[PDB]
Design a protein around this ligand. Structure first.
Ligand code: GNP
Ligand code: GNP
Ligand code: MG
Ligand code: MG
Lengths: 166, 166
């Protein structure tokens, strides 16, 4: 069956893993649990096609360097996550975008900018900032909350259709 | 506030109106009620931006001709709906696509192919057929059910982000 090799990328503490686990296990993880590397496979039906989603949940900070080079070359599409109440996480998005471009030899790699934690009133990144960024990269911008499940299948299905249309 | 002028297009009986009403009024219309022309405005928040959705729900069959020319030139983006248990409705999609192209003077107009009634086991249009069609047009393909609300905000938000990225 069709498999789509997805990787969730972004700064430490932005909700990469809580996003991933709301999709696969249907619940919010409210605690401190930093990732090294975690892999999830789930058979799912998207727009009538049977497929398997093979998600690689990555570390934010780490000694991950060209140890990131390795998962970035096998990933077919990328969720690039930041948190809307953390301005620094938003500036680091550029970092992840160029390093993805570098290793894939491509300027057009399947990608969606995800602004997570939208349930929180304490926003420091305006939607318009991120909308314009995502438009400069030729990329979709979707806001999510791993807390309320607002936008999580959206962000992930949108990325599977980007890989389709590539 | 930003307004997005959306129009729902497609053959008679495909679920144009039940799709529209599940979005705006949160319920399934199980009856016979053909449309002439209906308009819906709703203030909504998509990906943190405040916007108003101005949806034009159109007639499928009619004496609608260049009386369709008029709403097709003011529409910013189009949902092109067919039903997955009606092969003829799927072949007519081409009709609506060329006439949209003609009046907008454009080959790149915001559009998403929607395959509705996916809750029904009695499919005559395979997902792969429609996936390939939608890929030949450079367009997203999303399946919906106005009955279960499966995919309806998806199909509509996807089209608002196409207008954004245009
Ligand atoms: N309110 C709110 N909190 C969230 C959301 N997503 C994650 N969190 C909280 O943010 C914290 C960090 O989440 P986690 O998913 O572990 O983030 P990470 O990006 O995976 N961190 P790491 O890079 O170290 O692996 C946790 O306390 C989590 O409960 C969200 O959408 N909203
Ligand atoms: N099972 C199922 N039935 C649906 C769905 N969408 C619409 N229907 C049924 O299909 C019939 C026609 O629906 P309607 O929404 O009126 O279609 P239309 O495309 O708007 N028709 P018209 O072009 O004449 O205006 C109704 O009986 C409706 O209840 C769906 O997703 N699933
Ligand atoms: Mg993590
Ligand atoms: Mg109707």
């Amino acid at each position: 069956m069709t498999e789509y090799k997805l990787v969730v990328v972004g700064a430490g503490g932005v909700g990469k893993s809580a996003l991933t686990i709301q999709l696969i296990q249907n619940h919010f993880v409210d605690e401190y649990d930093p990732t090294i590397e975690d892999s999830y496979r789930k058979q799912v039906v998207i727009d009538g096609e049977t497929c398997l989603l093979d998600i690689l949940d990555t570390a934010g900070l780490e000694e991950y360097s060209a140890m990131r080079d390795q998962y970035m070359r096998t990933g077919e599409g990328f969720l690039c996550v930041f948190a809307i109440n953390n301005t620094k996480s938003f500036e680091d998005i550029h970092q992840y975008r160029e390093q993805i471009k570098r290793v894939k030899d491509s300027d057009d790699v399947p990608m969606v900018l995800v602004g997570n934690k939208c349930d929180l009133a304490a926003r420091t990144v305006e939607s318009r900032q991120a909308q314009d960024l995502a438009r400069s990269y030729g990329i979709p911008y979707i806001e999510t909350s791993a807390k309320t499940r607002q936008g999580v299948e959206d962000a992930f299905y949108t990325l599977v259709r980007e890989i389709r249309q590539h």
